[PDB]
Amino acid sequence: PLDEHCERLPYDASKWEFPRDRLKLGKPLGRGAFGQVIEADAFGIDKTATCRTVAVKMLKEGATHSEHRALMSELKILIHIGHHLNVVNLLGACTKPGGPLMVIVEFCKFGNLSTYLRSKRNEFVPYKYKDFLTLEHLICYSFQVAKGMEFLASRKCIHRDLAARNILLSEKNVVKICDFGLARDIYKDPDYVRKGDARLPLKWMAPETIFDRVYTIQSDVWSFGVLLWEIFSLGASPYPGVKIDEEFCRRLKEGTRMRAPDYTTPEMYQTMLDCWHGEPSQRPTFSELVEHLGNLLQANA
């Protein structure tokens, strides 16, 4: 994957650099130990003379030169990856000396999908209630994330933290993959469990990642299976009531899997099980998931 050697990638300022004085910073959207994302109004960032709400990632008190380097590498990878409907897209950056490094991307009106789905439990019907979610919505979100991941894989990039908290919902039921990264407080966040000298999203991780620290596109497929469970539980937390310890990891390696969530179809639950194959090479590819979910979306209609 090209996303592990980011320091050699180009930053073309003539294309991406956006003047600080055209960016009006607003309220924080998320804050971690070293990073934060701020809502902003950017004047003319993507369309001449047009104000646009954007999301700006930058560092905060506690960050060091190390995090500054990391954020520059993030900027470089976003440029390399390029645009897709189902990934949050880069709009510009402020990199000039005298102010903080700022990475400016599309703002997504409804925010993270897990929180959103959990807000709609009382506003769901399998089939049609104007603003209700339906099975069609849930399969559609699943299909979109698969399309985004197929795209990322095509760019030789791996996500490493795929989960509903890293999927954002925009207008018109469009969902976008993101990575909040440093803007998430992984100490306070119960989704990230202490494992040695790191805080890791253990409930989303493939066995080979947990045990061998191996990250590949096919470990992303495992995480995609967990995301499917999150979608079809309407934003529930994975492995309900289970202590995430050494016994959890062993049983997982042994072949223990989550039961079907409340809103799933049989085919969608089988798709989760397929993503959770013990053998990485035997999991579906994102291209295959795109095909399959597209078929399920049609079967739903």
* Positions in the binding site for ligand 0JA (CB under 6 A): 29, 37, 55, 57, 74, 77-78, 81, 87-88, 103, 105, 107-108, 110-111, 152, 157, 159, 168, 177-181
Helices vs. strands in the chain: H and E counts, helices first: 9, 10
189 is catalytic: no
Cβ-based nearer residue to ligand 0JA, 31 or 121: 31
Cβ-based nearer residue to ligand 0JA, 67 or 74: 74
Residue 30 annotated as binding?
yes
CA 98, 103, 105 angle in degrees (round to 5)? Answer: 145
Cβ-based nearer residue to ligand 0JA, 42 or 87: 87
Cβ-based nearer residue to ligand 0JA, 74 or 230: 74
**Distant-in-sequence, close-in-space partners of 59: CB < 8 Å, separation ≥ 6:** 34, 35, 36, 67, 68, 71, 100, 101, 182
Through-space distance between the first and last CA atoms of the chain, rounded to whole angstroms? 38
Residue 31 annotated as binding?
yes
Q: How far is the CB of 249 from ligand 0JA (least distance, A)?
A: 26
Q: Around 218, how many Cα atoms within 13 Å sit in the side-chain half-sphere?
A: 14
The residue from 12, 46, 131, 161 that is catalytic is 161
Residue 44 annotated as binding?
no
Distance between CA atoms of residues 165 and 94, nearest Å: 26
Residue 198 annotated as binding?
no
Q: How far is the CB of 29 from ligand 0JA (least distance, A)?
A: 4
Q: Look up residue 163 and give its DSSP letter.
A: S
Q: How far is the CB of 178 from ligand 0JA (least distance, A)?
A: 3
Q: How far is the CB of 258 from ligand 0JA (least distance, A)?
A: 25
Distance between CA atoms of residues 110 and 107, nearest Å: 9
Give the residue nearest to ligand 0JA (CB): 111
Cβ-based nearer residue to ligand 0JA, 154 or 256: 154
**Distant-in-sequence, close-in-space partners of 248: CB < 8 Å, separation ≥ 6:** 202, 239, 242
Distance between CA atoms of residues 68 and 79, nearest Å: 17
Residue 51: alpha-carbon gap to chain centroid: 26
The alpha helices in the chain, defined as continuous H runs, are: 13-16, 65-81, 113-119, 135-154, 207-212, 217-231, 246-254, 266-275, 286-300
Q: How far is the CB of 90 from ligand 0JA (least distance, A)?
A: 7
Please give the positions annotated as active site: 161
Q: State the binding site.
A: 29-37, 57
Annotated binding site for ATP: 29-37, 57
